[PDB]
A paper describes a structure:
Lassa virus (LASV) [name] (NP) is the only known 3′-5′ exoribonuclease that can suppress type I interferon (IFN) production possibly by degrading immune-stimulatory RNAs. NP is a multifunctional protein involved in viral genomic RNA encapsidation, viral RNA synthesis, and immune evasion. Our structural, biochemical, and cell-based analyses have demonstrated that NP encodes a functional 3′-5′ exoribonuclease of the DEDDH family at its C terminus and that this RNase activity plays a strikingly important role in IFN suppression. We therefore propose a novel immune evasion mechanism in which NP suppresses the IFN induction by selectively degrading these immune-stimulatory RNAs.
Additionally, we provide for the first time a high-resolution crystal structure of an active exoribonuclease domain of Tacaribe arenavirus (TCRV) NP. To determine the structural basis for the possible differential activity of TCRV NP in IFN suppression, we crystallized the TCRV NP-C domain (residues 364–569) and determined its three-dimensional structure at 1.8 Å. The overall structure of TCRV NP-C was very similar to that of LASV NP-C with a root mean square deviation of 1.30 Å from residue 364 to 561. The five conserved catalytic residues from TCRV NP-C were located at almost identical positions as those of the LASV NP-C with some minor conformational changes. The potential [name]-interacting interface of TCRV NP also largely resembled that of LASV NP. Specifically, residues Arg-489, Gln-459, and Ser-427 in TCRV NP were located at identical positions as the corresponding residues Arg-492, Gln-462, and Ser-430 of the LASV NP, which coordinated the binding of the cleaving strand. A noted difference was that residues Ser-485, Gly-423, and Pro-390 in TCRV NP were located at the corresponding positions of residues Lys-488, Asp-426, and Arg-393 of the LASV NP, respectively. It is noteworthy that these residues are not phylogenetically conserved, and that single substitution at these residues in LASV NP did not significantly affect the exoribonuclease activity of the proteins in vitro or their IFN suppression in cells. We found that TCRV NP could process both ss- and [name] templates with similar efficiency and substrate preference as those of the LASV NP. Taken together, our data strongly suggest that TCRV NP, like the NP proteins of LASV and other arenaviruses, has active 3′-5′ exoribonuclease activity and can effectively suppress IFN production, results that are in sharp contrast to the previously published report.
Residue numbers in the entry: 358 to 513, 524 to 564
Write the structure that this text describes.
């Protein structure tokens, strides 16, 4: 408990989680399977804020599937992610918090694995077309928020846009609201802390 080389990261995450208001809508999305997640985002539109972090997968062979066909995150761009950050964020979430999601199955599993059966999920149950209404607009306006999706998406016309946990949250909220947010949410976790020097 005393002397950790990751004391800073821990304090940063604690400070970020303390900013979450359990009275407001909070979105959560992950990329990667719930057993080996590689990207996590929480987004609270009412406070114009988000928590966003990464982790290196433990199953590198399995990671290839999501990388090529879903999220487009290359191993090179997350191999230096500080381990445990993603789990620490989940561990700190307030008791019994209501979390908004699109497609609850994998998130439920993720949270259950983390022993967070107390967290409650709303699934907005969008169709794919509904969920991604604002995809191009979100990448145009907010794409600079995540530069970690550099792999071309293969179809197992034109390549699909890769899925980013953060931009997914933003575009899902935009779909629910009918419009993109006023302007630019603010990161609660400084990017430089998500990765090894
Ligand atoms: Mg997603
Ligand atoms: Zn991303």
């Amino acid at each position: 408990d005393i002397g950790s080389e990751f004391e800073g990261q821990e304090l940063i995450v604690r400070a970020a989680v303390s900013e979450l208001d359990p009275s407001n809508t909070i979105w959560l999305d992950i990329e990667g399977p719930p057993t080996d997640p590689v990207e996590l985002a929480l987004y609270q539109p009412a406070k114009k804020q988000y928590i966003h972090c990464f982790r290196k997968p433990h199953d590198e062979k399995g990671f290839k599937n999501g990388s090529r066909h879903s999220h487009g995150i290359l191993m090179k761009d997350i191999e230096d992610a500080v381990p445990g950050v993603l789990s620490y964020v989940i561990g700190l979430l307030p008791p019994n918090m209501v979390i908004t999601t699109q497609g609850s199955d994998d998130i439920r599993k993720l949270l259950d694995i983390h022993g967070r059966k107390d967290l409650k999920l709303i699934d907005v149950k969008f169709t794919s077309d509904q969920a991604r209404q604002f995809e191009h607009q979100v990448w145009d306006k907010f794409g600079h928020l995540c530069k970690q999706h550099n792999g071309v998406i293969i179809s197992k016309p034109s390549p699909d846009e890769p899925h980013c946990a953060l931009l997914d949250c933003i575009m899902f909220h935009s779909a629910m609201s009918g419009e993109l947010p006023k302007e630019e949410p603010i990161p609660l976790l400084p990017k430089e802390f998500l990765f090894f020097p």
